[PDB]
């Protein structure tokens, strides 16, 4: 007696399915060794299909793709508030599995409404090479008859027996349930009367019997409620789980079943022969590139046009025609591109020159044709050089990609492979075929477009973005189910930070010293026990930021589809699986600091008429690499940790080249480096090559531009292609080969090495140890083509705010104009910096952020009622008419039709308006004329010429100026933020209780005790309240009230608050503030004068140090009062301020 499970869910039905697919199949495997078989039947979708396939055909086991389709009581278009129910599906040929696809992609692309729904319509469409199974109980025909509509059940079963034929078998499961007993009773009729086969299954949901609790909390985390509700999501047993045929028949009697539904499980199982193209299979699916052009031969083209732009002092059309006369600009590249491999290689026969680019590229191309990829680099160079010519940024490349000149040549790559050593056969290995990864960098604004692009140009139907899968981290996992057990979240959060943290993420709860923290608690035995029970387990399916497809055909005909909630068309598989698949994937990254490069240029132009075309910019700037080594990386890309600042200070970098190593070596690992890297760099230390003489002919020309480190992998690849002999292709297997540190297979490469290394030079006692250097710095070594090209931008960004510095401030503004929290600092960034940030004004804004002469001037569209129209608008009418000569020339020329009463009153407030006069005489003048102005054309459009036509407009209404509480708070409401002020500062009592500032927070706390309390003090702005200085804000646990908090800080929860009218109440103390410069005969000048005063005020000292502002308050003694003016009669600034100790 043996049993094959048809039915079983996977931590794929993301909601219920809790077992994981590895665990499962060893679980089936050990029950059942012959000839094992299992379903993989998910909830309404496709996704561990490819994995599960892979990972049951490597333990043996026999995979089955299923589905359980939710299929929808009518159409699948229907968005009616009949339902939906359930249907069990099973591939049994490769026909089948494409049905499948077509069928789960159908279910989200059209017919998804709470679940991804089908049609009986598309399941007759899609029925051939399926095997369908009655199914759950929320299926039709088990529903019906609960309903007691057994005639609809029949009709229904005669419905999809015109469907699938006698690939329809009448499911059978038992549960402890008594509406089992009713509908099999009845099914079974069924089965008799058509002639159908039973087969039974059981629904599986978890692995063991004994994960029924694990599964059960599983269903409390997204239902998200205690382990006693009730109301809480639960199933109404604990059977969902991989029996043993003996316990399958306990549920399944053999005197009323008998043998037919357990031998029918295993002959379904045998007939359901679908293979996927994986690995010993697995064809290359290259889309075609449209072009008398062979697809190698464009390519050529390309790259032949592509030099002669990209040398322009060593690539002529003159040394074409000499290269062509050894056997139109654009006629002559057409020409070179036919040229044959047989007649290449007798001119080789026969400093980066010329003839050098020439043999580079042609052996580049040589290497790709003979791989057969110029299609795929045809693809790519394609969709880049569109965007170029459509206003999308491109970075000059990322990972090996710009190694390849031919990548260079023809565009996809943009910096000079050659001028800096990097190597094409680090990209194309040209030992191995393997396709190559080009992934690109765009301007984060703008991606989409490029993928909307590649969408058109492609197809629709074969072209998505690739889907990701998040896991569920350990940390997390122990918090979700200690939160279901009715833990409290404090000693919840103590048991999470138990587990080590690694790499980044956290350690398995497999491993994880502590665990004596069990034995106390029985509760917390099960919590641990749980949590690493659904460890493996899935959240949901998102897009990934990146990753797409462009399949060769239609998509749904290999790849499951989806549709994201922005309508992103989205794989069902992962990057891994769609790779396995041998589908083209491409990544195309969002990059903020080009979509900053590209305002930078946009108010650069308009500035000051200058048009930056960064990828003509010299290298060796010297105002450039001088602000750098200041350590001015404020905005600059790649390098702006607090660290990295401080290390590019210390280095004082002089070249692009110290940018590319720096960046190269700061990180855990080789950080250790960088110190020799800098005594070597400053002209102070020796770059010796002693321990290597008969090597150092080869070690110098590479290493010689990092300082004598071995820095790249390409330096690596390199010094064994030199030394060895090997091949540079042969040199990148050595850097995986060291990679992989494989136990002994590292020894078949040294004696290739020292045999290679004696018969150059090397006298093999060298040979041996230059080995060792090899293998120790291949652990650290970096990709230099990929720090190269990055390094680039950090450059660009650098040069841009080295000569254009306002520009620079106003794009940082620009870019990030909707950060409300973002826009203030960066106000503050430029305000303590030299440059002033001016309010928006009618007559000098422009539409967004601008630079008018050395000053940021806030653009019109940053004012919060005007709508877009309106600004452009403005903007418009003060182009054909000239500027506006005041409030009424404002509003005759603007109707209100336009301009609204409510977009003019912000105008007002946000200061667009001040050149007019006082702002509350503005606001107050407002309604006066706009009656004036709508009676102006009610006059001009009943004739009357100019005079008679207008009795010019009255003054300014007159009222009482503002306040600058009130004036500051217009102020935010119609720009967000506070310019030019801060309500805080207006009372500064506040201020000098505070014991620090929102941005000192982070600094002044971490060195003290563990979570520590403090007071801060600032303003409030929430209905989780937000706390706001002159120097930021603050999440803390109504509007335009000032406060003092009282908090602890790890984050900042908030312990105690105190009102402005209370802190001004509290007794006072004095506070003297004196600078750094104070001689020894002064701390007993100050100490006499306060010693001559007593009283019981405490002395409190504010000194300005060298780094940092202390706060010691005094000793013993306490003055009374009278001494502040007395102490103001002298050298010494003083206050009253509220005494510090009371809160
Ligand atoms: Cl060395
Ligand atoms: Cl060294
Ligand atoms: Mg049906
Ligand atoms: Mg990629
Ligand atoms: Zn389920
Ligand atoms: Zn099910």
């Known amino acids: 007696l043996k049993f094959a499970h048809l039915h079983q869910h996977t931590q794929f039905s993301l909601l219920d399915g809790a077992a994981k697919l590895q665990d499962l199949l060893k679980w089936v495997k050990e029950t059942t060794p012959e000839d094992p078989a299992l379903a993989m039947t998910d909830h309404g979708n496709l996704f561990g299909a490819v994995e599960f396939y892979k990972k049951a055909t490597a333990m043996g086991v026999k995979p089955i793709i299923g589905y359980e389709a939710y299929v929808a009581a009518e159409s699948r278009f229907d968005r009616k508030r009949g339902g939906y129910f359930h249907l069990t599906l099973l591939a049994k040929d490769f026909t089948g599995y494409q049905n499948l696809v077509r069928l789960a992609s159908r279910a989200y692309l059209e017919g998804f409404y709470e679940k991804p729904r089908i049609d009986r319509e598309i399941l007759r469409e899609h029925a051939q090479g399926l095997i369908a199974l009655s199914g759950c109980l929320g299926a039709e025909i088990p529903q019906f008859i609960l309903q007691d509509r057994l005639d609809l059940a029949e009709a229904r079963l005669n419905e999809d027996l015109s469907i699938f034929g006698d690939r329809f078998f009448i499911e059978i499961q038992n549960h402890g349930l008594p509406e089992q007993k009713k509908v099999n009773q009845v099914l079974k009729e069924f089965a008799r009367k058509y002639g159908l086969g039973m087969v039974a299954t059981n629904d599986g949901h978890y692995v063991r019997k004994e994960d029924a609790r694990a599964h059960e909390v599983l269903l409390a985390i997204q239902s998200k409620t205690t382990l006693d509700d009730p109301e809480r999501w639960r199933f109404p047993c604990d059977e969902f789980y991989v029996k043993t045929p003996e316990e399958m028949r306990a549920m399944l009697p053999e005197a009323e079943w008998g043998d037919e539904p357990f031998d029918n499980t295993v002959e379904i199982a045998?007939?359901?022969?679908?293979?996927?193209?994986?690995?010993?299979?697995?064809?290359?699916?290259?889309?075609?590139?449209?072009?008398?052009?062979?697809?190698?031969?464009?390519?050529?083209?390309?790259?032949?046009?592509?030099?002669?732009?990209?040398?322009?002092?060593?690539?002529?059309?003159?040394?074409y025609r000499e290269v062509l006369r050894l056997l139109d600009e654009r006629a002559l590249a057409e020409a070179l591109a036919r040229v044959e491999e047989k007649a290449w290689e007798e001119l080789r026969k026969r400093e980066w020159t010329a003839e050098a680019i020439l043999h580079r590229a042609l052996y580049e191309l040589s290497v790709i044709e003979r791989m057969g990829f110029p299609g795929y680099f045809l693809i790519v160079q394609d969709y880049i050089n569109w965007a170029r010519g459509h206003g999308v940024s491109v970075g000059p490349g990322r990972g090996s990609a710009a190694g390849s000149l031919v990548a260079y040549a023809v565009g996809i790559t943009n910096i000079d492979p050659l001028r800096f050593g990097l190597l094409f056969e680090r990209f194309l290995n040209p030992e191995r075929v393997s396709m190559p990864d080009i992934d690109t960098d765009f301007s984060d604004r703008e991606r989409d477009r490029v993928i909307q692009y590649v969408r058109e140009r492609y197809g629709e139907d074969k072209v998505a973005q690739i889907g990701t899968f998040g896991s569920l981290a350990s940390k997390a996992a122990l918090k979700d189910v200690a939160r279901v057990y009715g833990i409290p979240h404090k000693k919840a959060e103590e048991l999470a930070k138990l587990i080590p943290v690694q790499f980044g993420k956290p350690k398995p709860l497999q491993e994880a010293e502590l665990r004596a923290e069990m034995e106390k608690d029985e509760r917390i035995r099960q919590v641990i026990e749980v949590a690493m029970r659904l460890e493996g387990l899935n959240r949901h399916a998102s897009v990934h930021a990146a990753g797409v497809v462009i399949?060769?055909?239609?998509?749904?005909?290999?790849?499951?589809?989806?549709?994201?909630?922005?309508?992103?068309?989205?794989?069902?598989?992962?990057?891994?699986?769609?790779?396995?698949?041998?589908?083209?994937?491409?990544?195309?990254?969002?990059?903020?600091?080009?979509?900053?490069?590209?305002?930078?240029?946009?108010?650069?132009?308009?500035?000051?008429?200058?048009?930056?075309?960064?990828?003509?910019?010299?290298?060796?700037?010297?105002?450039?690499?001088?602000?750098?080594?200041?350590?001015?990386?404020?905005?600059?890309?790649?390098?702006?940790?607090?660290?990295?600042?401080?290390?590019?200070?210390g280095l004082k970098p002089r070249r692009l080249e110290d940018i590319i190593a720096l960046v190269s070596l700061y990180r855990p690992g080789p950080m250790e480096h960088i110190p020799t890297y800098i005594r070597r760099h400053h002209g102070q230390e020796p770059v010796s090559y002693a321990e290597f003489p008969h090597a150092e002919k080869y070690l110098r020309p590479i290493l010689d531009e990092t300082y004598g480190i071995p820095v790249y992998q390409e330096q690596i690849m390199q010094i064994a292609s030199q030394v060895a002999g090997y091949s540079l292709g042969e040199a990148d297997l050595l850097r995986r080969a060291m990679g992989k540190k494989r136990v002994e297979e590292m020894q078949k490469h040294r004696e290739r090495f020292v045999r290679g290394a004696k018969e150059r030079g090397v006298p093999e006692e060298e040979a041996n140890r230059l080995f060792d250097m090899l293998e120790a710095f291949a652990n650290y070594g970096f990709n230099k083509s990929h720090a190269a090209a990055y390094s680039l931008l950090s450059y660009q960004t650098a040069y841009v705010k080295?000569?254009?510095?306002?520009?620079?401030?106003?794009?940082?503004?620009?870019?990030?104009?909707?950060?409300?929290?973002?826009?203030?600092?960066?106000?503050?960034?430029?305000?303590?910096?030299?440059?002033?940030?001016?309010?928006?004004?009618?007559?000098?804004?422009?539409?967004?952020?601008?630079?008018?002469?050395?000053?940021?001037?806030?653009?019109?569209?940053?004012?919060?009622?005007?709508?877009?129209?309106?600004?452009?608008?403005?903007?418009?009418?003060?182009?054909?008419?000239?500027?506006?000569?005041?409030?009424?020339?404002?509003?005759?020329?603007?109707?209100?039709?336009?301009?609204?009463?409510?977009?003019?009153?912000?105008?007002?407030?946000?200061?667009?308006?001040?050149?007019?006069?006082?702002?509350?005489?503005?606001?107050?003048?407002?309604?006066?004329?706009?009656?004036?102005?709508?009676?102006?054309?009610?006059?001009?459009?009943?004739?009357?010429?100019?005079?008679?036509?207008?009795?010019?407009?009255?003054?300014?209404?007159?009222?009482?100026?503002?306040?600058?509480?009130?004036?500051?708070?217009?102020?935010?409401?119609?720009?967000?933020?506070?310019?030019?002020?801060?309500?805080?500062?207006?009372?500064?009592?506040?201020?000098?209780?505070?014991?620090?500032?929102?941005?000192?927070?982070?600094?002044?706390?971490?060195?003290?005790?563990?979570?520590?309390?403090?007071?801060?003090?600032?303003?409030?702005?929430?209905?989780?309240?937000?706390?706001?200085?002159?120097?930021?804000?603050?999440?803390?646990?109504?509007?335009?009230?000032?406060?003092?908090?009282?908090?602890?800080?790890?984050?900042?929860?908030?312990?105690?608050?105190?009102?402005?009218?209370?802190?001004?109440?509290?007794?006072?103390?004095?506070?003297?503030?004196?600078?750094?410069?104070?001689?020894?005969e002064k701390g007993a000048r100050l100490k006499s004068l306060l010693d001559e005063h007593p009283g019981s005020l405490p002395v409190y000292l504010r000194v300005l140090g060298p780094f940092g502002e202390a706060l010691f308050a005094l000793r013993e003694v306490r003055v009374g009062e009278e001494a502040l003016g007395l102490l103001e009669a002298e050298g010494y600034r003083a206050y009253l301020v509220p005494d510090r100790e009371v809160f």
């Open 270 to 319: 045998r007939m359901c022969d679908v293979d996927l193209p994986i690995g010993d299979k697995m064809v290359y699916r290259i889309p075609r590139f449209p072009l008398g052009r062979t697809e190698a031969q464009y390519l050529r083209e390309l790259t032949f046009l592509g030099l002669l732009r990209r040398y322009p002092d060593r690539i002529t059309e003159a040394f």
């Open 551 to 649: 399949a060769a055909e239609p998509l749904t005909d290999l790849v499951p589809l989806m549709r994201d909630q922005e309508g992103r068309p989205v794989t069902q598989y992962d990057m891994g699986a769609v790779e396995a698949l041998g589908l083209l994937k491409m990544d195309f990254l969002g990059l903020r600091t080009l979509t900053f490069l590209d305002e930078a240029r946009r108010i650069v132009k308009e500035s000051k008429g200058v048009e930056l075309d960064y990828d003509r910019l010299p290298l060796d700037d010297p105002k450039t690499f001088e602000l750098l080594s200041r350590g001015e990386t404020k905005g600059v890309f790649q390098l702006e940790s607090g660290g990295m600042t401080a290390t590019v200070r």
């Open 802 to 1080: 080295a000569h254009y510095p306002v520009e620079f401030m106003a794009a940082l503004l620009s870019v990030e104009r909707h950060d409300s929290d973002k826009v203030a600092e960066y106000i503050r960034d430029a305000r303590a910096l030299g440059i002033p940030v001016l309010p928006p004004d009618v007559n000098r804004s422009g539409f967004d952020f601008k630079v008018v002469g050395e000053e940021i001037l806030f653009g019109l569209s940053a004012v919060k009622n005007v709508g877009e129209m309106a600004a452009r608008a403005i903007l418009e009418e003060r182009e054909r008419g000239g500027p506006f000569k005041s409030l009424g020339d404002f509003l005759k020329r603007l109707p209100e039709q336009v301009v609204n009463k409510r977009a003019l009153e912000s105008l007002v407030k946000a200061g667009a308006l001040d050149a007019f006069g006082d702002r509350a005489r503005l606001l107050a003048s407002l309604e006066p004329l706009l009656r004036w102005a709508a009676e102006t054309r009610e006059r001009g459009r009943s004739g009357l010429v100019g005079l008679f036509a207008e009795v010019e407009e009255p003054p300014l209404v007159e009222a009482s100026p503002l306040d600058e509480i009130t004036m500051l708070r217009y102020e935010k409401e119609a720009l967000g933020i506070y310019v030019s002020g801060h309500p805080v500062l207006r009372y500064p009592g506040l201020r000098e209780v505070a014991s620090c500032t929102i941005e000192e927070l982070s600094e002044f706390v971490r060195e003290l005790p563990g979570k520590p309390k403090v007071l801060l003090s600032g303003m409030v702005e929430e209905v989780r309240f937000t706390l706001s200085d002159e120097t930021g804000a603050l999440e803390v646990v109504k509007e335009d009230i000032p406060l003092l908090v009282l908090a602890e800080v790890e984050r900042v929860l908030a312990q105690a608050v105190w009102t402005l009218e209370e802190v001004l109440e509290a007794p006072k103390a004095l506070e003297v503030e004196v600078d750094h410069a104070l001689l020894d």
